[PDB]
Amino acid sequence: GRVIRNQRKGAGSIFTSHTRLRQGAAKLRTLDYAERHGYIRGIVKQIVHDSGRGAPLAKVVFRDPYKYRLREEIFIANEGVHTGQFIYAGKKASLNVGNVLPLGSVPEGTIVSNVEEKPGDRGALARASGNYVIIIGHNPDENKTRVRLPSGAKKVISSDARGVIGVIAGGGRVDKPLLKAGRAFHKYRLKRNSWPKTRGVAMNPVDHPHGGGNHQHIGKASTISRGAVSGQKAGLIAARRTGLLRGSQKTQ
Amino acid sequence: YATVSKTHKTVSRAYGGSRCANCVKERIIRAFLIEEQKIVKKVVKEQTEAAK
């Protein structure tokens, strides 16, 4: 047997990220004396398009605590932040669309973006265009904070962990039909080498499990167990159900 | 620009060959007013910190 497409993406030889035009790594400020005791100001001097990211980035420049100079940050622009605006970052900082605050510091029910998992990891959750985390309440002693990540999961993380007020810009991008092959083509031209895709069941047994047969069909359950081996996990991996989702989903 | 004479790279005002005058206009006015209003906020909270 050959080696199936979704194994070859591993040593990523043609499979890596098309990275030439990207404005840099979007990350929060490194967590220092300013942000963890008080606050600090920066000016958003530019918000700009990143190639291969749906949501605009915001270039947000600060001063330096310990040397005469400037320091420049790449943020993901939460919807509404604007050039020239002032941005505040710290424990004792304010509650406005754009500042960064420890999760403990916001009244429950706030809305934050680019939020850390561990504090000081400089950004992590709700970063796509339109996503955010809502906060559903804190735990006074052992300073945690329970939240609802965009996938609907409900995770508990540190209150010293930072987020930034608002939803992320560029929302609803995906309500618009890609419409032709080409727009899809360019979409992924700036992302990676994943498009277009060829139905396993169009190829030959060498090439796939789904491959072979005098009729184009799958032949066995396309639900593949969790503890399957590389070379087997093609189709619906480890599914606990299948079929058209009848009724109201939504998280409980 | 290194084979040419110094006054081909400046206009005589402060921030010559750097900013666009109307842009220098701003940083003057903003500077004064702020350093002024920075003083308006001296007395006001000198008064709150002596008469609350």
């Binding site: 300013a34 005791h37 008080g38 606050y39 600090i40 100001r41 001063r63 330096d64 605590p65 040397k67 | -």
Partner: protein, 233 residues
């Protein structure tokens, strides 16, 4: 006052670049530094056994100074003195004809680990000094134990190099004595007496106590202010 002004500086976050301070506590030392430092730490955190840790109990500046004094009166021959002995016994004894004894009996400190230890076994040593350094600690840890069983007084001095100087080496680990000119014989027992105070007699009692188990200050302070609140309301 004259044409001079005073306008301090607002070093309080969000303004005025911080002044240079002593970041002495926050420096990225060389790895070789970290190693010797954390080895000290690691050594204290654990519960170190009583056959070791019965070190860490050194001598004291006072009683030691008196022993560094008394032992210097018995340094070994230097290169000069020996060559000088030679010719003052070369021509002297090989011609004048003595029993190779137109030369005095020397009274000097014994040393070198294997030397000192045969001495303790022959019950001939009369006062043994033990280093507290010795990074191969297994070289000497059996000496306190031995001296007790051989009924011989001893004491663990501070310094492996300090013992060295009073013997003309870089480092000596152990110095000891079997001889003492009767001019000193009395001051010796006034030393051996206090020596047997802090060591030889405390030895059995010492063998019961496990050293170490000490917390880092950030920890002790945490716990000091927690076993304080759960009891005093």
């Amino acid at each position: 006052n004259p044409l001079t002004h005073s306008t301090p500086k607002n070093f309080g976050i969000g303004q005025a670049v911080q002044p240079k301070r002593n970041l002495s506590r926050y420096v990225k030392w060389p790895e070789y530094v970290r190693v010797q430092r954390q080895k000290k730490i690691l050594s204290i955190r654990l519960k170190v056994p009583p056959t070791i840790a019965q070190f860490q109990y050194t001598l004291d500046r006072n009683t030691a100074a008196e022993t560094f004094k008394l032992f210097n009166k018995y340094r070994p021959e230097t290169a000069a003195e020996k060559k000088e002995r030679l010719t003052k016994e070369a021509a002297a004894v090989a011609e004048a004809k003595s029993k190779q004894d137109a030369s005095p009996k020397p009274y000097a400190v014994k040393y070198g680990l294997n030397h000192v230890v045969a001495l303790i076994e022959n019950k001939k040593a009369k006062l043994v000094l033990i280093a507290n350094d010795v990074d191969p600690i297994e070289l000497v840890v059996f000496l306190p134990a031995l001296c007790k069983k051989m009924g011989v007084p001893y004491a663990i001095v501070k310094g492996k190099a300090r013992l060295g100087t009073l013997v003309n080496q870089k480092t000596s680990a152990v110095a000891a004595l079997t001889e003492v000119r009767a001019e000193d014989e009395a001051a010796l027992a006034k030393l051996v007496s206090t020596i047997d105070a802090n060591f030889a007699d405390k030895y059995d009692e010492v063998k019961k106590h496990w050293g170490g188990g000490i917390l880092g200050n950030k920890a002790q302070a945490k716990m000091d202010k927690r076993a304080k609140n759960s009891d005093s309301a």
